[PDB]
Amino acid sequence: LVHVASVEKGRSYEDFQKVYNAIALKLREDDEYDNYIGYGPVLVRLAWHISGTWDKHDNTGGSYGGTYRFKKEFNDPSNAGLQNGFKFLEPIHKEFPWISSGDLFSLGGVTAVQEMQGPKIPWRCGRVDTPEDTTPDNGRLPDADKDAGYVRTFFQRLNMNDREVVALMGAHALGKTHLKNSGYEGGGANNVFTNEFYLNLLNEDWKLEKNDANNEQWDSKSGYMMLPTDYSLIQDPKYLSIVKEYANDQDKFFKDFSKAFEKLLENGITFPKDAPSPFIFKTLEEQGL
Template sequence: MAEAAVASQLSLMLKASLADSSSHSLFASTNSIACSSRSQWHRLSQPPPLFVSSLLPPPLDRGSVVNASTSGGFNSVASPKCAASYTDQLRGAREDIRELLKSKYCHPILVRLGWHDAGTYNKNVKEWPQRSGANGSLRFEAELKYKSNTGLVNALKLIQPIKEKYPSLSYADLFQLASATAIEEAGGPKIPMKYGRLDASSPDHCPEEGRLPAAGASSPADHLRKVFYRMGFNDKEIVALSGAHTLGRARPERSSWGKPETKYTKNGPGAPGGQSWTVQWLKFDNSYFKDIKAKRDEDLLVLPTDAALFEDPSFKVYAEKYTEDEETFFKDFAEAHTKLSNLGAKFDPPEGIVLDAAP
């Protein structure tokens, strides 16, 4: 079969296989004009299930053209790009993500995708990519199959056509671009971002399972600190990042948390079902803190790690502040989100590529 025919067939299969994109989050310059190279070998298996795994060494340059192969996967063909061209692809991808959000209402799962890729970072490990973090390793089956990442295959299905359209982009950048764009398009703060992240090139670079927060830990506050302190966050940042639960729903079939549906989720948007933390679960605001504090709506979800924000004395200081002051919450959240999106990343060029001036 000709390559063009295979590519067309795979594109149709991807579109046909898109599942519900709503899910819950477990948490939680001047452009350089120099050309640079990056490693990124990848393969996308036929759905379902859809996993991205590595092909054969040696790695190729950052700029690559993705071609369909007769095996049903994708190969990277070297086509080096300059930072200026990379910036153009970032801008194009951002516009396509905005359109995707309008049609699929997938803000929550795109936030979760970026966070779960970055949230494996270990500040005590200096080597890249062994320190994990925002390096695109979540695309590999070895990491994608972890219990904490259940359902994120749907996020990969959603953004894979964008990756194919803008093949020079690293998965690490695309994950973080999608996450920040979803926050902003939901009414949240502008997230100061930089790009140029390198991709981990092998499943051998995936972290061990268990680095992400677990909602049902026996000592929720201690558990949050253990996980987030390992990444280099403080108590204020933990509470601010928890506020992203203002978006999304928990589905019991994916996380063992939440109701099958509530009066707020039974009619969608998107596929119906699940239990949300807030009434308007596609709007980014400070409702999460208000609703947890009020505890008056049994159709809204409160996980043990959510409740801990108002039970732990240190966390409570910030949770109370964010309940009353949305502007402060937005400011602190934007700073923490930016920090999260850069954890463990290796940038090429080293200073990164900035699309927009800092707000």
């Protein structure tokens, strides 16, 4: 099973920067969402969930097909709450109807990271919408109530190693959990991309509590929370080494995150040798907009 990237006809860097700008301007304008967190974090989560269905064994799932637009995937209980991100992007899809669904969902993630003062993330175009029968079945996204061994094994399906896993998990500095979506609550209200996830893991006094959905989570008096899968990063000696590395080197964390997130968004896609190089988009701030 081969998914070959095909550039939207006649489109170049300037077309995709226009789409980035549209997303970025709406992120700035629709700022009230989720108690003034804004849509940044949910767009990062959406980019990850549409990519995180991939299976390296048979090349099914992944971002290429834009299959989240179909009912089976849209209604996956693992995707509860992502409808808010889809609704955000819908007017963008209408203004730029030539962009494929997988390109738009993945670009929404890149735009959100960058606009939240995260690292630059190189991005490639050419995902092509595939039909409804290519939609992966539910149950390919990870459970939160598990341990390190589970996390490690899970991410092997996505061809991610320990360092890639720990770097990706730093996105849990962003946004929050919502009881009605996942059965976890809390986490604060952060919408600036930093390495604080690692600092918080190492420095907070964590307590194992049960929430109103009868699930266990780790809570601190500062108002932060860790999922069991988050906390497992300090229980496993290989993960703990990497947590310490990112807690002590913001730049290293940004660079490793950028590479792992690009890889996540590109898994399953074959880029022809003559494809355009990856694009690095300017932020609104860089453009003076």
